[PDB]
From a paper:
Sterile alpha motif and HD domain-containing protein 1 (SAMHD1) is an important regulator of cellular 2′-deoxynucleoside-5′-triphosphate (dNTP) in mammalian cells. Although the HD-domain contains the active site, dNTP hydrolysis requires assembly of SAMHD1 into homo-tetramers. Here, sequences at the N and C termini of the HD-domain stabilise inter-monomer protein–protein interactions and incorporate four pairs of allosteric nucleotide-binding sites, AL1 and AL2, which regulate the enzyme through combined binding of G-based (AL1) and 2′-deoxynucleoside (AL2) triphosphates. Using combined biophysical and X-ray structural studies incorporating nucleotide analogues along with mutagenesis experiments we have now discovered that SAMHD1 uses a bi-metallic Fe–Mg centre to catalyse dNTP hydrolysis in a reaction similar to those catalysed by HD domains in both human and bacterial phosphodiesterase PDE enzymes.
Co-crystal structures were determined using either wild-type (wt) wt-SAMHD1(109-626) or a D137N-SAMHD1(109-626) AL1 allosteric site mutant that generally produced higher resolution diffraction than wt co-crystals. A further effect of the D137N substitution is that D137N-SAMHD1 is activated by xanthosine-5′-triphosphate (XTP) rather than GTP through AL1-binding but nevertheless maintains comparable catalytic parameters for dNTP hydrolysis as those observed for wt-SAMHD1 and GTP. We first determined structures of two co-complexes of D137N-SAMHD1(109-626) in the presence of Mg2+, which is required for tetramer assembly and catalysis, with (i) XTP (AL1) and dAMPNPP (AL2 and active site), and (ii) XTP (AL1) and dGMPNPP (AL2 and active site). However, with regards to the active-site nucleotide configuration and metal ion content, it is apparent there are significant differences that are crucial for understanding the catalytic mechanism of SAMHD1. This is most evident in our highest resolution structure, D137N-SAMHD1(109-626)-XTP-dAMPNPP-Mg, that clearly demonstrates how three octahedrally coordinated metal ions Fe, Mg2 and Mg3, support catalysis through interactions with the bound substrate, as detailed below. Inspection of the D137N-XTP-dAMPNPP structure reveals the key residues that position the α-phosphate proximal to the HD motif-coordinated iron, and are likely important for dNTP hydrolysis. In particular, the nucleotide 5′ oxygen, as well as non-bridging α-phosphate oxygens of dAMPNPP make hydrogen bonds with SAMHD1 side chains Arg164, His210 and His215, whereas the β- and γ-phosphates are coordinated by Mg2. The two non-bridging α-phosphate oxygens form coordinate bonds with Fe and Mg3, one phosphate oxygen coordinates Fe with an Fe–O bond distance of 2.2 Å and the second phosphate oxygen coordinates Mg3, with an Mg–O bond distance of 2.3 Å.
Numbering used by the authors:
A (entry chain A), C (entry chain A): 114 to 275, 284 to 599
B (entry chain B), D (entry chain B): 114 to 276, 284 to 599
Write the structure that this text describes.
Amino acid sequence: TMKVINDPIHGHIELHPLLVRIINTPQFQRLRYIKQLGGGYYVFPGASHNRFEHSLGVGYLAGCLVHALGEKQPELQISERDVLCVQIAGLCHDLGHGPFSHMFDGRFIPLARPEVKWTHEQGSVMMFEHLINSNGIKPVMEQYGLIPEEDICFIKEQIVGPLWPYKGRPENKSFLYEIVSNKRNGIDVDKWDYFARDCHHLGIQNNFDYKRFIKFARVCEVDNELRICARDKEVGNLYDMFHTRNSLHRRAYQHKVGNIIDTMITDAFLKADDYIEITGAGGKKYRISTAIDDMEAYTKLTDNIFLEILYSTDPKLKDAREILKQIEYRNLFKYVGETQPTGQIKIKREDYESLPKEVASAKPKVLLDVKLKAEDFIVDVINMDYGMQEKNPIDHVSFYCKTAPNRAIRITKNQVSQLLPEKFAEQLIRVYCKKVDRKSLYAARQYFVQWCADRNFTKPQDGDVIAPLITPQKKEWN
Amino acid sequence: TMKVINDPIHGHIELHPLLVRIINTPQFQRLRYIKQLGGGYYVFPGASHNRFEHSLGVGYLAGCLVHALGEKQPELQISERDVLCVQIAGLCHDLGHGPFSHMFDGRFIPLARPEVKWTHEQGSVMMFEHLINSNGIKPVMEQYGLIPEEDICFIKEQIVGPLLWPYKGRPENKSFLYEIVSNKRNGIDVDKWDYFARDCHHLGIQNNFDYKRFIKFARVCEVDNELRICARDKEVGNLYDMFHTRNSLHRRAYQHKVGNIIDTMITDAFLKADDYIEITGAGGKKYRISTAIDDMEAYTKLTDNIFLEILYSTDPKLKDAREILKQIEYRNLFKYVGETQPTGQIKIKREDYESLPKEVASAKPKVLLDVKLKAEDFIVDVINMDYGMQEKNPIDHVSFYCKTAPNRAIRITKNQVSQLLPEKFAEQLIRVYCKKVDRKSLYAARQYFVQWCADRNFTKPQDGDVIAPLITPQKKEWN
Amino acid sequence: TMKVINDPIHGHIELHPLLVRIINTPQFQRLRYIKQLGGGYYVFPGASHNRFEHSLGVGYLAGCLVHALGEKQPELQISERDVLCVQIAGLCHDLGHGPFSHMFDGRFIPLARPEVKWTHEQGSVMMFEHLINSNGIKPVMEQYGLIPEEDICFIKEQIVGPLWPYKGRPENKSFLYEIVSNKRNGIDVDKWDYFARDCHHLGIQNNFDYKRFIKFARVCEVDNELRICARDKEVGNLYDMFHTRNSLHRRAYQHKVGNIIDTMITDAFLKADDYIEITGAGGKKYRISTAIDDMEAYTKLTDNIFLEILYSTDPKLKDAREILKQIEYRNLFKYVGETQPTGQIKIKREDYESLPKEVASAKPKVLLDVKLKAEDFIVDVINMDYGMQEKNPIDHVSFYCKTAPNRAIRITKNQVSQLLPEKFAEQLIRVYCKKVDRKSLYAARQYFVQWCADRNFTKPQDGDVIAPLITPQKKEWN
Amino acid sequence: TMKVINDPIHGHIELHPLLVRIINTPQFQRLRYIKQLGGGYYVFPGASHNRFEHSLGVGYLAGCLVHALGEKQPELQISERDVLCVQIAGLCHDLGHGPFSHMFDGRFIPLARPEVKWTHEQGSVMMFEHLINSNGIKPVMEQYGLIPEEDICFIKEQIVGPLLWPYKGRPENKSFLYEIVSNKRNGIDVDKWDYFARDCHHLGIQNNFDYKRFIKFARVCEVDNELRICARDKEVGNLYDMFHTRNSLHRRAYQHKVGNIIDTMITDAFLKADDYIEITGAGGKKYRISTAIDDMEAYTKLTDNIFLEILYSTDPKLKDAREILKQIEYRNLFKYVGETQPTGQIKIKREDYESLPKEVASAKPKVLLDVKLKAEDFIVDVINMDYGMQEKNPIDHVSFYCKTAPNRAIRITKNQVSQLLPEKFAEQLIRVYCKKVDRKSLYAARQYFVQWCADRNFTKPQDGDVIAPLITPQKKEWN
Ligand SMILES: Nc1ncnc2c1ncn2[C@H]1C[C@H](O)[C@@H](COP(=O)(O)NP(=O)(O)OP(=O)(O)O)O1
Ligand SMILES: Nc1ncnc2c1ncn2[C@H]1C[C@H](O)[C@@H](COP(=O)(O)NP(=O)(O)OP(=O)(O)O)O1
Ligand SMILES: Nc1ncnc2c1ncn2[C@H]1C[C@H](O)[C@@H](COP(=O)(O)NP(=O)(O)OP(=O)(O)O)O1
Ligand SMILES: Nc1ncnc2c1ncn2[C@H]1C[C@H](O)[C@@H](COP(=O)(O)NP(=O)(O)OP(=O)(O)O)O1
Ligand SMILES: [Fe+3]
Ligand SMILES: [Fe+3]
Ligand SMILES: [Fe+3]
Ligand SMILES: [Fe+3]
Ligand SMILES: [Mg+2]
Ligand SMILES: [Mg+2]
Ligand SMILES: [Mg+2]
Ligand SMILES: [Mg+2]
Ligand SMILES: [Mg+2]
Ligand SMILES: [Mg+2]
Ligand SMILES: [Mg+2]
Ligand SMILES: [Mg+2]
Ligand SMILES: [Mg+2]
Ligand SMILES: [Mg+2]
């Protein structure tokens, strides 16, 4: 029978026994030990929530959406098999996150292993595999009518991605790939859970209503494929859903101090990578940066690694340790400012590594007790968008009208409002300095404002205050 | 001593005894009987809150903001006198609302009395006066150190605006105090803070604006020889979001197309009863629903009750008004036909509102009509949506300060913040409804309406291809 | 199809079209104009909620409970017919409330019409009838498979009450009478809605979890009747549910000032009863106290009557009007104190009318500038209990164990905790005075404390402060 | 200047720079790594909150209560010095918790070191000292007007209790200040206020106690020649309810039978690793999990991390400890057999706890056993539930005041309030579990257990008729 668990976002929820089996493994339980927001806790003290609780929510919401499509449209032929496959994918979608979640695949692995291209989603697919194989799950699947050759492939495709590119289900069931991770427009139950769950812990209040969206969702034919569509009148609510997502990145997930703590932690991990060993399959030894290649080692790789370093006495870890100690005493690299590009220019990823030199080379009208080298500056480039680079995701939604419920239509931005955004992607540039005394910091402010003046970037907000000698060098800034 | 009242939004709050005296009058207590959202309750059933509770909130928030400026900046010389004046203005700011709140000054009075220019705010100033004079409040004011010649004028100016430096009630060294209750400079005031949180609690839509945060990072600075309320630089994102919230609540709630049509029907019923209902005012004289605004003793008795007065009547002269209210209860409302907007930098002037139904009725549909409809059959509702300052960006009229130079104000432009912010700050929405509700009449109304949009070069209705498949292909600008 | 309404307690909920038909009548819509808590709004300013919204909640919760029993136990043979009958009874259960809700049947009608025995529930049954007959509902019922001779009788029995006493369903469906109004133990969805809804508006927070109770509810055989039973482990939560109910009466619904405002309003209505006329069926004229005998007149009788009196100019209503004006200026009868009986004594309802004389006759050790008559005192006797006079309602619940799910058992108080109440009913006595100057009030405090001393009632809490000369007359009170 | 932090329970709060200095130490930051509810997270998945956030809350509430007494009663002469001392004690009150919080001082240390009498509070006093001394805080204190000889002693006494009038840190005219952080007189303190609201937020169980209300109606009065915090008379009902809430949260959450068994298993694992894990302390010395309490430099590094240290190890000497932790992850827990309570005025003394499993194992079931079970197979968990003062009514140790005589304290007895309040204020619950988990072993455990209850004259288990139908009829007292 069901097992009931009490979650503070979604209340008392029912867990099917196949879900319970998957949950009660070391591979799943690992997610108790990885914080959702990583370094965000060191800015927002309510944000101690881990990936475990998020994963139960996503699995529960995935079931809610699929059941409701089924009740109202029996003609879709949604079976109990289908429902369970969707539920499992929801539950297991984030099994591949590593320590501090997006710090791990966003910053560490790219710095430590420039030869691979990895994502937490690929991790989730591998860790799902290991979990199934190492705990006897396959017979239990069959015991509830699932067919492993086909259904495991279906689960993995829902998590990671792939005429018709899918082996696990055919075109008459394409709507099912739109639940857990929606590649077409990004409207998925993953976002629904983290919006509500992150807001509860952060202390910032949620303004999106997922339950409403589920009441007015429907499957229609669009270009010979069955797809999830929304009532026409929900269009304003979907623009607002993406606005919420951007707001939460601005206030929380990209908080300038949040990001710098993740940077320092990444640093500390880089200086310990050589010296820590994790035992994997067949007794072999892996490092923090290679543990991703062996799921038995990866199983034991969690936020704990922070304290392993912080509590060590090995002299080979002193360097890594001293960085973590600077965090505890709150001696953080200092935030210098933010700026953005201009015209319609972009900054290409190749050039990220050249930026600190450029700042160091700005020749401010000299009144300076220290000259600063490139090693002293960090430049953090952040790409903010509506989840589809510079496209409008609402261009990739279909709607229906009360008068013709089986007929999809499109609704353009013009038809909605002139107060909507004109663009859907931008870049923010933050600069910090590692030298933390008043002299070094004063200087760094001058280099930085000169650099913005030189590249024709926006004028930093406090520019007149931090660099009164420099902001006059542009007419364009009065 | 203080009196403590428990409010569900703000919790346990302390009411100074002068505030208690003002509250316990028939002029104040009237606000128990006027719904904050008017016809909105007939769409959102949690929205039974009245103006009374809102007014206590605004008064409590006004005192919060002023005390906090005081604690942190003793150099401003904010007195207890000042605090109480601010508290009273917060409390009395909406005393002039009439039945169903914005329905009354937004729709009824303009239809019924085109010759006057009236607002609920001017009502509040007059009703404040009546309340003071008819309840002996002036002595009590003095008893707590207020000076009525000056302080009444101060209270009134905070509510309505001004009646070189246009204020008689306080001088330029106290200009920040006019920015609390109703902020004419940029619209960031405690009225909005209370109704965001209060409306969201009752509607079942969740609020994302944090007023308390704003108050922690607020500060008084000199800007163009005037002392003003300014905010930390890092709050700029949150202020754009505050205005976004306001606009969202109009789209979801306050301008819901069925909410507005209920307010329209109620305004109709009031128009057809205006001749026949009599409200006794000062010196025994008789007023009507449309004239009660001219006598505060009559206006005191003018509340949402008037709806039920009409609905429960037997007078044969009220049958017309009554039949409309019956159509509401059985849920036979006018039918929504659709929405459209203008284009380019075209605008629709308020003079022209009354001509629109004729224009819709005169659309020449391409040789396909079995029944005509007249202008009397259509409603056309023009709604101005903006960031509270017509077409201006209100964030251009905010001043900021930086952590390193706390006494020095600055400005921050839109492009220093984000490329994803709105490119405009005002727009108009046009809704069309039909009073004939059968399938035939409604089909036809959809054709006239989509033709009209095609003719005036307005945007394409969302469901246009579904409701008028024969028309929407005829237009280059839409395919 | 369904119609969706957004309620702030229960969210977006679905209304079956037969429910929509019943809702969109003058008989139903009347409930927009009767406050749930009556005079409670004049103490708790958030408490402007009306009976309309409560009634939609009860109808929605009734459907939730019945559907969930059905899903999990197909063998009960719960049909769509049954579900709809339960939903309708939920929706229409409070159609008979009059102005200010419990003020009307608790105070006014007993004073104004001592010859009848009336309750809001009997009103609901009559008003249901009128609503059906006067709006053509009967064909619509049949159109969804309902059978009016039987099903209307079922609905009415669920609301008001009745070997087996029920004509509308047989013993194999007795559990259905336990949803809307539970006569056996009082655990019903009416309470669930008002707990949550009243807490939202009052500003006091709810500590009972109805959704939990629904997950662990089950139908078992008990004395040859099918009944709703709960998991064994919920026993503590049910004691706490009744504790919550008592707490909400103490803090809110019996607030001493709340009750006195209801008293003054009742007064005002008594002095207008002769002079107000409500037109009923066949042009006949009814009064506030007789409108309960004609549903067409009763339809137009709501909280509006307060303002009708307050706004009048008719000289025959001056008396009633002046009472309402005393409310607006906040010149309320003054609260003197509270006391309770002692030993295990009770105060019988016959004697209520003699109490003010008794207080007036107390001979305090005289230092008094006014002597006071009986007409000057009010004595309000309040019976507080767990909804079953002096029984323990948890003695009338059945439970089941995880090991034997179809087998009912009982759990006694002893088996649970020694910190539970020893009694389940008590009476509170409040005294007020209508003379409001300082002299009259000081005196009233002396009469009252002498009276408590005389009848051997508990010592008023502030006794030593309000009557320092009198509390020494008892050794037993040091 | 102030530093503002956003807490989800209390919102945006201001941290004095001395508080910031104390917070940004390894001794304070340690609390990020100890779960408030210990094994409770393994039952309630929202309960991942740690002691760090709680400690910020308690510190903020302590300042709220003391400032409010100050505003309303200037005659108390509460200084800024006093306020800061109270704030610091609130903030540092739980610095001595160890891994999994109450598991550590409730279960592990008593098992592992029966010779000492230790509490997390005494830990907090020592860890406070270490934090001050190892981070240079004493100068900073003086820099804001504190006097360390006196003020450190004051802070410590507020946390732990006393070290005629037993306090060295403040005199009798300031006794009310000891009633804020940890109230020895009646248990009404701000620690409880924070954890009620914080635990409820994370658990998904809703709180019904309103602290802010309590603070509006609090007042300092003379009672038996000592100045004390007193409450309005009308709050008496709410205080009985505050203690009812506390007891409800233990029944639903903190003593959940599976929560407690997880804490038991973890304590087991710690016992089997104690010999083999070494924590470096002051002057390079090595401590164990059970001795780290004797050296604050070692104890600094002792947190919930130790669980994962064991779980992730490969040392063969830790296999025993590791295997228990693996049984947790696969969800093979000890099995709950049932609950019972004593009767009359019988009590179970703490000495005897260790003898109970033998007694259960020795029940002679009526000639019906195919397998025996040993004492090593049973757990018996005795839990003391009370209103925080053993068997006393804490409301007997509260003072009240009346609206008409605000400076004069009084008492209110139980019978002046209600006949529905509890007749007792303490009880014991006994839970029995089995470490053999198969159907045979479990069946048998149920027989031994129900026989044992029948033998000692304890209450009848809830499911007794279902689990042991052959035994429950044999007992007069139960049918
Ligand atoms: N009174 C209460 N109120 C609220 N939540 C509660 C609660 N009691 C537990 N929870 C939460 C804690 C969990 O997250 C969830 C399930 O806890 P159990 O219902 O206690 N189920 P278990 O498996 O112990 O008993 P069995 O196997 O006998 O059915 O409810
Ligand atoms: N237990 C409670 N919990 C929460 N709010 C409560 C409450 N009791 C009342 N309220 C609400 C109702 C009101 O909004 C407010 C104050 O009611 P009182 O504190 O009852 N004050 P009053 O003037 O009756 O007594 P006095 O003059 O002797 O002080 O709190
Ligand atoms: N964006 C929004 N967010 C939250 N609640 C909303 C909302 N819009 C409406 N409500 C609430 C108001 C109501 O309580 C409920 C239904 O409002 P509609 O969904 O607007 N349904 P209607 O009958 O106008 O349109 P149709 O007939 O075309 O389906 O949702
Ligand atoms: N928009 C927002 N809304 C709510 N909480 C927010 C927030 N932004 C931050 N927080 C939370 C995070 C923290 O708990 C707190 C303060 O963060 P900052 O106000 O960002 N202060 P910091 O020290 O970075 O900047 P400076 O030194 O220049 O003043 O509010
Ligand atoms: Fe996710
Ligand atoms: Fe307002
Ligand atoms: Fe009800
Ligand atoms: Fe604590
Ligand atoms: Mg993911
Ligand atoms: Mg995604
Ligand atoms: Mg009072
Ligand atoms: Mg206004
Ligand atoms: Mg305004
Ligand atoms: Mg009822
Ligand atoms: Mg009932
Ligand atoms: Mg900072
Ligand atoms: Mg403690
Ligand atoms: Mg304590």
